[PDB]
Amino acid sequence: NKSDAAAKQIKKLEEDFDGRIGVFAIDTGSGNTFGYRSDERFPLCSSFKGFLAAAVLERVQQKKLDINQKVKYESRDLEYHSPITTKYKGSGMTLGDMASAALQYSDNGATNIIMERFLGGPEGMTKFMRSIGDNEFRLDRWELELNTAIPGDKRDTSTPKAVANSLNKLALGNVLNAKVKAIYQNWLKGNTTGDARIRASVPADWVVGDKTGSCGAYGTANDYAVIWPKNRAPLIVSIYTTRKSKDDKHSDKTIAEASRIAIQAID
Amino acid sequence: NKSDAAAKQIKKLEEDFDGRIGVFAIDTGSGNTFGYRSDERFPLCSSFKGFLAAAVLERVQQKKLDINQKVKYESRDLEYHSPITTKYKGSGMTLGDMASAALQYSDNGATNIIMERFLGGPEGMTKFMRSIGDNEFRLDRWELELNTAIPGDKRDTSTPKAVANSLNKLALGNVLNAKVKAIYQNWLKGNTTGDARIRASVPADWVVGDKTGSCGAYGTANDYAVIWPKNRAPLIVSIYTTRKSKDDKHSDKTIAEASRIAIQAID
Numbered sequence: 001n002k003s004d005a006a007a008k009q010i011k012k013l014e015e016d017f018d019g020r021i022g023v024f025a026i027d028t029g030s031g032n033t034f035g036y037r038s039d040e041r042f043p044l045c046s047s048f049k050g051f052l053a054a055a056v057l058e059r060v061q062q063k064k065l066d067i068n069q070k071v072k073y074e075s076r077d078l079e080y081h082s083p084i085t086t087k088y089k090g091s092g093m094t095l096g097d098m099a100s101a102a103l104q105y106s107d108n109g110a111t112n113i114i115m116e117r118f119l120g121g122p123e124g125m126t127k128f129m130r131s132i133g134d135n136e137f138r139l140d141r142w143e144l145e146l147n148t149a150i151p152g153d154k155r156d157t158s159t160p161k162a163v164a165n166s167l168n169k170l171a172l173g174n175v176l177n178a179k180v181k182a183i184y185q186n187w188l189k190g191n192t193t194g195d196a197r198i199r200a201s202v203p204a205d206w207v208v209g210d211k212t213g214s215c216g217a218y219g220t221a222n223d224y225a226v227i228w229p230k231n232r233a234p235l236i237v238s239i240y241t242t243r244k245s246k247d248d249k250h251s252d253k254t255i256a257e258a259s260r261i262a263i264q265a266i267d
Numbered sequence: 268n269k270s271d272a273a274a275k276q277i278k279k280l281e282e283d284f285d286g287r288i289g290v291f292a293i294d295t296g297s298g299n300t301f302g303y304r305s306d307e308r309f310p311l312c313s314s315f316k317g318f319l320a321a322a323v324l325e326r327v328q329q330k331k332l333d334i335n336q337k338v339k340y341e342s343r344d345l346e347y348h349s350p351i352t353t354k355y356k357g358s359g360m361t362l363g364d365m366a367s368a369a370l371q372y373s374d375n376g377a378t379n380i381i382m383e384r385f386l387g388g389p390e391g392m393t394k395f396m397r398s399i400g401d402n403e404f405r406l407d408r409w410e411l412e413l414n415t416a417i418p419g420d421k422r423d424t425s426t427p428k429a430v431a432n433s434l435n436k437l438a439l440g441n442v443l444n445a446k447v448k449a450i451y452q453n454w455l456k457g458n459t460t461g462d463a464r465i466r467a468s469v470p471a472d473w474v475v476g477d478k479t480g481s482c483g484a485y486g487t488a489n490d491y492a493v494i495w496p497k498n499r500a501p502l503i504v505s506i507y508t509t510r511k512s513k514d515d516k517h518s519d520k521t522i523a524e525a526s527r528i529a530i531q532a533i534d
């Protein structure tokens with residue numbers, strides 16, 4: 001009944017704000033899961049940047065790239081919302097610094113630079129996800145056009161379950177070695193954009209790493225997280241939302257409440 | 268929960284002054300530790316000069332340099348805050364005297380001279396730290412640019428834990444031989460800049476060697492110390508702080524208080 005009760009609550013919440021909520025959560029201790037619309041497609045928005053950073057780290061661990069190599073872009077016309085890359089344009093940034101900027105500040109210049117030079121574009125990003133056994137994720141376009149969030153459009157989408165599974169494999173599993181995995185975890189823990197979302201759904205003293213997305217159309221926003229509860233095995237939580245109308249604004253509170261519901265469902 | 272109690276106290280202290288405090292402390296006699304934000308990055312400021320001095324001593328021990336060789340610089344335009352090098356510009360200084368000046372007086376001319384001629388610049392300084400198994404420390408720039416302490420900037424940072432571990436290895440461990448280690452200890456014991464920080468958190472008759480950092484922007488300041496309590500095995504304490512606003516001044520009192528808290532946490 002517990003799963004059906006949680007589903008009832010998400011359904012009401014999505015109706016309350018005239019939109020659509022997709023959830024997948026895992027208690028990695030018990031194996032218990034909860035899903036709601038967990039196989040439906042939602043726009044990725046900036047959330048894919050969390051996976052981009054993991055792809056960089058994999059290349060680093062395979063010795064194909066060096067985390068400390070200098071990335072120069074002195075001549076580049078920086079994309080909108082490049083707060084970190086803008087500041088270091090004169091000096092360059094290390095590959096590590098650029099990747100973590102993409103994740104923690106949603107820096108679009110950092111994102112496009114990495115895809116152009118190191119990852120093989122949206123195709124290469126998709127191939128990375130295929131390489132870890134994620135068959136749902138697809139990135140089709142570059143920043144910022146990947147953020148259109150048009151209803152029914154399959155471009156630049158994944159599913160809540162596929163996102164949760166991939167995050168589990170990357171942040172907690174075997175894809176990255178112990179050393180590089182710890183770097184990835186630290187990057188997620190230092191994300192700056194997620195304070196009103198999954199982070200808002202758990203006690204102050206639980207440790208959270210997350211990445212958000214906020215397309216800026218169709219009230220489309222999301223969050224995924226690895227949560228370390230005090231003295232317990234970690235949780236994985238993946239929350240994706242869309243809204244009916246183009247001009248609808250996203251709802252952080254809806255995301256946080258859906259997170260609260262999912263966490264109880266697997267408890 | 269003695270750890271949890273101490274964490275609550277540091278958290279409150281950082282909220283009190285609208286900033287961020289990172290702590291790592293070791294009782295070398297029991298191996299007990301306490302950490303708070305101990306894996307987060309903080310600007311090194313002048314504190315790296317304590318490690319620069321150790322790097323010089325290692326070169327001396329390897330017979331790549333002589334502690335008494337004359338270092339001349341009669342034509343040099345000395346960096347701001349070079350009180351010791353300024354006084355011997357006409358005659359030169361011994362390598363040992365120059366290195367101890369860098370540590371005990373935060374002499375910027377001493378610092379840059381040593382990095383230019385003997386250590387291979389910021390890259391060589393970083394290589395030294397890597398050579399003792401410190402994987403977090405990074406020096407990217409020269410004096411005085413390394414002191415900008417821009418929020419979110421990873422240049423010229425380390426973590427409290429890595430700083431404490433490295434200080435343990437250098438001041439108390441096996442990197443330097445018994446003879447050269449004694450010189451390093453004496454240099455730290457004679458630091459002149461740390462009276463209001465870790466030194467202020469222990470009794471007058473405990474022996475302390477330390478190095479401070481005071482970036483001079485973003486209320487960014489720090490201290491690390493080896494402490495010999497009367498009749499007890501030595502302690503290692505590492506305290507790093509930042510503040511929210513550019514014009515915020517550093518807080519010696521907050522550093523001293525965080526040190527008091529850390530020392531109790533491990534006792």
Ligand SMILES: *C(=O)N1C[C@H](NOS(=O)(=O)O)CC[C@H]1C(=O)NOCCN
Pocket residue numbers: 045046047081105106144145147148193194212213214215216217
């Ligand atoms: C990512 O989806 N971004 C970047 C930025 N912050 O990331 S968030 O914390 O995840 O929201 C806000 C804008 C957003 C977009 O680039 N959206 O594009 C809107 C029109 N293309």
Ligand SMILES: *C(=O)N1C[C@H](NOS(=O)(=O)O)CC[C@H]1C(=O)NOCCN
Pocket residue numbers: 312313314347348372373374375410411414479480481482483
């Ligand atoms: C070491 O931390 N510093 C900080 C200094 N900037 O702080 S400021 O001088 O107050 O602006 C730059 C280099 C180095 C020192 O020279 N330290 O001594 C300066 C006075 N505490």
Ligand SMILES: [Cl-]
Pocket residue numbers: 097100101102104105419
């Ligand atoms: Cl960052």
Ligand SMILES: [Cl-]
Pocket residue numbers: 043044045145146147148149150155156215
């Ligand atoms: Cl989209």
Ligand SMILES: [Cl-]
Pocket residue numbers: 278281282
């Ligand atoms: Cl805080």
Ligand SMILES: [Cl-]
Pocket residue numbers: 327332333334335
């Ligand atoms: Cl010698």
Ligand SMILES: [Cl-]
Pocket residue numbers: 380383384
């Ligand atoms: Cl020189």
Ligand SMILES: [Cl-]
Pocket residue numbers: 379383409
């Ligand atoms: Cl130089």
Ligand SMILES: [Cl-]
Pocket residue numbers: 310311312412413414415416417422423482
């Ligand atoms: Cl700095």
